[PDB]
Design a protein around this ligand. Structure first.
Ligand code: NA
Ligand code: NA
Lengths: 304, 304
């Protein structure tokens, strides 16, 4: 009874982002995850330099054909994240579409990376938005947008928790049964150094489970945390199917331990009061193996 | 505290061979292994079908350039196996050369993939023009090599008909450069029957007193009547890992590497039986996590 995941995201030689942030953790948890490297770069673009090559839509299709010709196109989950190419995203769609005809129970976990905010900056060309809205989101079962992307995808601005839950409702109608807004500008009663995370899941009649978590903000900028988050949400939602509460507590806790370790190590390498380089800030992935297998819970999600 | 490994080998979407058979295990053991994917194919070439792209020497050099520009060209180990093309293999040589000027203590683990003996004769798996390159450029930069008998014969230019002749070939190989030589598999007679294959290992080192000594071992291992791809890649990855933990104990490093292979293969065999096409024989990697972490010794090497 193996669980197979096709994860189509970027690859870097040094460091952890994309498939590099998603693969080791999912393997450690027991998933037969296959990685399609959308690109292969020396390191992430947050460094002073980078070099690499990209996979084009034709090559992505060629790889799928090999899998299909061998009858190896039967997956339990599909996982996608940052893509900067309209043509590539469209091929992804055709593939998930076909994997779904092949296995109707397939769960597509989509991290709709578009940009972030007090105002916004896109990370992808503007023509991807319509594809995400019209072709990607409708195929997805789990999406993990941040506030800014939740707004973009729904066309509505979010100024509060209730408008956020209304925007998730609209996203559910677009198709996915699970929506988790991974970061927002909503205030927490816990302090200015906290942010709100909201999750919603539609699931015997039709019931809704909605949750809220208040989590500490990052005194720095880490790469690959959203890729890690999506991969972990996939794993924990798989293990605790009708419990978005526990699944998010484990996902977030796992992120906590990885970042905590990353932060201690980075400070121990940069100076005292010295802001660490992007290299020292790379996720301490391999060293958090035990936190990935069984993370100590350090957040409680409240059911709304 | 971290041990960085630069591993340049094939990548496949489905299955475990190349970087796919080498990465997860080394990450499980705590190594910061960076993978440069020399090809990206749907699955291994032992399947009825396969499609993919290959990385060329120019692209290999670009990626190295990125690591270089960020001053991330500092590794403790380099790991390589199946290489398909002369210019690619030469570029790999310029890279190891430089990593060694950067870190004179770097250990280059080289699996010199060339071919194998099938019937009355061997055949090559790569272009014949790689052989002079392995002899004159690669093997001399190598610290640990894992040839099968056929490859030890090509590299030494002497044919092997006995254990004693295998040991003389190992010495020639040591003189070419590598301080650790393992003839991972040979057609030599076993006092345990025709069902067994011989593994020979030899290591030269300077002891605390400054004396240069040599440890030699032999293992009589049972043959598996099936064709597994990726086992040579895993064996080299683990050889790297267990010689790193037991630097002056070849006997133990070898018993652990071999035992790890046994546990993986065995688990792969029970599964395959309970279902065998090449897909059925894929190494059960993620499920062998515990065995990779701390393998029960199931074979004892004899001291030569
Ligand atoms: Na995100
Ligand atoms: Na071999």
């Amino acid at each position: 009874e193996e669980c197979r995941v096709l994860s189509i995201q970027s690859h870097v030689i040094r460091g952890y982002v994309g498939n590099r942030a998603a693969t080791f953790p999912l393997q450690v948890l027991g998933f037969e995850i296959d990685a399609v490297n959308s690109v292969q770069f020396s390191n992430h673009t947050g460094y002073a330099h980078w070099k690499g090559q990209v996979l084009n839509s034709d090559e992505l299709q060629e790889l799928y054909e090999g899998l299909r010709l061998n009858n190896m196109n039967k997956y339990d989950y599909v996982l996608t994240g940052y893509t900067r190419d309209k043509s590539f995203l469209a091929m992804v769609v055709d593939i998930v579409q076909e994997l779904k005809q092949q296995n109707p129970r397939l769960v597509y976990v989509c991290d709709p990376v578009l940009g972030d905010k007090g105002e916004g900056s896109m990370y992808v060309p503007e023509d991807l938005l319509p594809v995400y809205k019209e072709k990607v989101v409708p195929l997805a079962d789990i999406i993990t947008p941040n506030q800014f992307e939740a707004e973009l995808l729904s066309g509505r601005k979010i100024h509060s928790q209730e408008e956020a839950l209304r925007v998730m409702d609209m996203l559910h109608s677009m198709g996915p049964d699970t929506v988790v807004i991974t970061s927002s500008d909503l205030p927490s009663p816990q302090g200015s150094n906290y942010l709100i995370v909201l999750g919603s899941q539609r699931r015997g009649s039709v019931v809704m489970e909605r949750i809220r978590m208040d989590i500490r903000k990052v005194d720095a900028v880490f790469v690959g945390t959203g890729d890690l988050f999506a991969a972990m949400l996939l794993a924990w939602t798989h293990k605790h199917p009708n419990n978005l509460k526990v699944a998010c507590e484990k996902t977030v806790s796992t992120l906590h331990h990885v970042l905590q370790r990353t932060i201690q190590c980075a400070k121990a390498q940069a100076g005292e009061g010295v802001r660490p380089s992007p290299m020292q800030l790379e996720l301490r992935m391999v060293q958090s193996k035990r936190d990935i297998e069984d993370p100590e819970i350090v957040v409680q999600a409240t059911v709304l």
